């Protein structure tokens, strides 16, 4: 089954700086800023679509679905590994920034793909949301501070 959520939010960080830190430099920044995340290793590709990353905390795999600096677009799918919930096939994120008042407007669309025709348990939704917002907010805070 397919379960989608959307969030729109804002940051004081302009989008090029925010995109650079969250997407371009994210692999290097995240292990440094989040104790629980040990490492992020590219196992396939060069950072374009198709790239696969192993995110160790147990671990999950992140696959780049789309990346565009010019439109501040980064779409990626989490699946697999020892850290991934058993009810989920994959979780696909679509993220886009746009300029707003010297900062950014942020749109995230998230699609949970469950096995079979299963609803999405609230606990799995919140786990994935908290981990992904946590990483984003940590990096954002870092950029604001430096």
Domains of the chain, by residue range, sit at 1-146
Cα gap 25→77, rounded to integer Å: 18
Find residue 95's DSSP bridge partners.
Answer: 74, 108
For the chain, state the CA radius of gyration. Answer: 15
How long, in residues, is the chain? 146
Are β-strands 88-100 and 103-114 bridged in parallel, bridged antiparallel, or unpaired? antiparallel
Cα gap 145→142, rounded to integer Å: 5
- The label of the residue with tokens 């600096």 reads 69
Where do the DSSP E strands lie in the chain? 2-11, 39-44, 52-56, 59-68, 73-79, 88-100, 103-114
Determination technique for this entry: X-ray
User: CA 43 from chain center: how many Å?
Assistant: 17
Q: Name the 3-class secondary structure at 8.
A: strand
Residue 68 phi, psi dihedral angles, 5° rounding: -145, 110
Are β-strands 103-114 and 52-56 bridged in parallel, bridged antiparallel, or unpaired? unpaired
Reported structure resolution in angstroms: 2.0
Find residue 52's DSSP bridge partners.
Answer: 44, 63
Find residue 142's DSSP bridge partners.
Answer: none
């Amino acid at each position: 089954g397919v379960h989608t959520f959307e969030e729109e939010s804002t940051s004081p960080v302009p989008p090029a700086k925010l995109f650079k830190a969250t997407v371009v430099d994210g692999d290097e920044l995240t292990p440094k800023l989040i104790p629980a995340i040990q490492s992020i290793e590219i196992v396939e590709g060069n950072g374009g679509p198709g790239t696969v990353k192993k995110v160790t905390a147990s671990y999950v795999l992140h696959k780049i679905d789309a990346i565009d600096e010019a439109t501040y677009t980064y779409d990626y799918t989490i699946s697999g590994g020892t850290g991934f919930q058993e009810i989920l096939e994959k979780v696909s994120f679509k993220t886009k920034l746009e300029a707003a008042d010297g900062g950014s407007k942020i749109k995230v669309s998230v699609t949970f793909h469950t096995k079979g025709d299963a609803p999405l348990p609230d606990e799995v939704h919140q786990d994935v949301k908290q981990k992904s917002q946590g990483i984003f907010k940590a990096i954002e805070g870092y950029v604001l501070s430096n």
